[PDB]
């Protein structure tokens, strides 16, 4: 809807930064709205959904098991590890690591998962072989959140991300069991409260994954819809601003308000 684009334009003016926006119909796959669809933005934590999608792909092929237990040590813990820092002794299963990586955005969990698939290169290789020749991951946590201007490392485009996410959640790649698991994790998101979820009316379905980083970086991907059922994928990115966390969240609030209003 045009008014939603106005909210995005208002956001660019008041934040002093670029904003990426894609509105994608989950049923048909037709884009309903776009803003800077072919420009690159830092993925930040949003890649973690893609990461666990690759892991689940290995689960389907029998190359990985969700119940497989992994142990690690103190020297594996990086910044922000709210879940993994509490299981140094008992370790964690692969299923728990993806749960921690998506719902709590655990960084160490993300790194351990990247080890299971063979690093950022293999995640990129996975995305390449499923049709996404655009999205790329180059570094580990937390260096991937650097968000240096004009740096293409660890970046996606709003169009590439939205189409890729659709293939994971409602495509032919994963099994029905794996598709359901991935969107179950996203629905249990704990760290995206004051964003899209804050805008939604009662009874709405939402499965999302937020993002934040350096140099006014912020992002979010989501699969949502009214009547307790997902009907649309929304991708929002922004970078380069010097605005605080609160104002960046407020712009997403304003954009979301128009999105739901003109649903």
Inter-CA distances, 142 with 21, 162, 175, 200, 212, Å: 25, 24, 31, 31, 11
Documented resolution in Å: 2.1
Residue 81 annotated as binding site: no
| Helices and strands, counts by H and E, the chain | 8, 9
Phi/psi for 64 (5° steps) reads -150, 150
**C-alpha span between 210 and 202 (Å, rounded):** 20
Q: Count of CB atoms within 10 A of residue 165's CB?
A: 30
Q: Which technique was the structure solved with, according to the deposited record?
A: X-ray
**C-alpha span between 232 and 107 (Å, rounded):** 28
**C-alpha span between 97 and 99 (Å, rounded):** 5
Angle between helix 47-61 and 107-117 (nearest 10): 40
Note down the domain range covering 196: 1-263
Of 3, 38, 143, 214, which residue is the catalytic one? 143
Closest by Cα among 70, 110, 102 to 87: 70
Q: Radius of gyration of the chain from Cα atoms? A: 17
Residue 258 annotated as binding site: no
- 131-147 exposure pattern, b = at least 16 Cβ within 10 A, e = fewer: ebebbbbeebbbebbeb
Show Cβ contacts of residue 85 under 8 Å, excluding neighbours closer than 6 positions.
77, 108
* Domains held by the chain: number: 1
**C-alpha span between 174 and 104 (Å, rounded):** 23
- Using alpha carbons only, give the angle 98, 226, 196 rounded to the nearest 5 degrees: 55
CATH code for position 77? 3.40.710.10
Is 45 among the catalytic positions?
A: yes
Residue 225 annotated as binding site: no
- Using alpha carbons only, give the angle 3, 34, 180 rounded to the nearest 5 degrees: 110
Of 45, 81, 178, 217, which residue is the catalytic one? 45
Joined tokens for residue 182: 């991935």
């Amino acid at each position: 809807h045009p008014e939603t684009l106005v909210k995005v334009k208002d956001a660019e003016d008041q934040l002093g930064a670029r904003v990426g926006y894609i509105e994608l119909d989950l049923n048909s796959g037709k884009i309903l709205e776009s803003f800077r669809p072919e420009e690159r933005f830092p993925m930040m934590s949003t890649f973690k959904v893609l990461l666990c999608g690759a892991v689940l792909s290995r689960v389907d092929a029998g190359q990985e098991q969700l119940g497989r237990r992994i142990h690690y040590s103190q020297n594996d813990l990086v910044e922000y590890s709210p879940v993994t820092e509490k299981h140094l002794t008992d370790g964690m299963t692969v299923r728990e690591l993806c749960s921690a990586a998506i719902t709590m955005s655990d960084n160490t969990a993300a790194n351990l998962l990247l080890t299971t698939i063979g690093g950022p290169k293999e995640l990129t290789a996975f995305l390449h072989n499923m049709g996404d020749h655009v999205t790329r991951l180059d570094r580990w946590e937390p260096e991937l959140n650097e968000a240096i201007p004009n740096d293409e490392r660890d970046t996606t485009t709003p169009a590439a991300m939205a189409t890729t996410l659709r293939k994971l959640l409602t495509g032919e790649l994963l099994t029905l069991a794996s598709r359901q698991q991935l969107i179950d994790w996203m629905e249990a998101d704990k760290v995206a409260g004051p964003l899209l979820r804050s805008c939604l009316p009662a009874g709405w379905f939402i499965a999302d994954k937020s993002g934040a980083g350096e140099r006014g970086s912020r992002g979010i991907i989501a699969a949502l819809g009214p009547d307790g059922k997902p009907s649309r994928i929304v991708v929002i990115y922004t970078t380069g601003s010097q605005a605080t966390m609160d104002e960046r969240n407020r712009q997403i609030a304003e954009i979301c308000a128009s999105l739901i209003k003109h649903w």
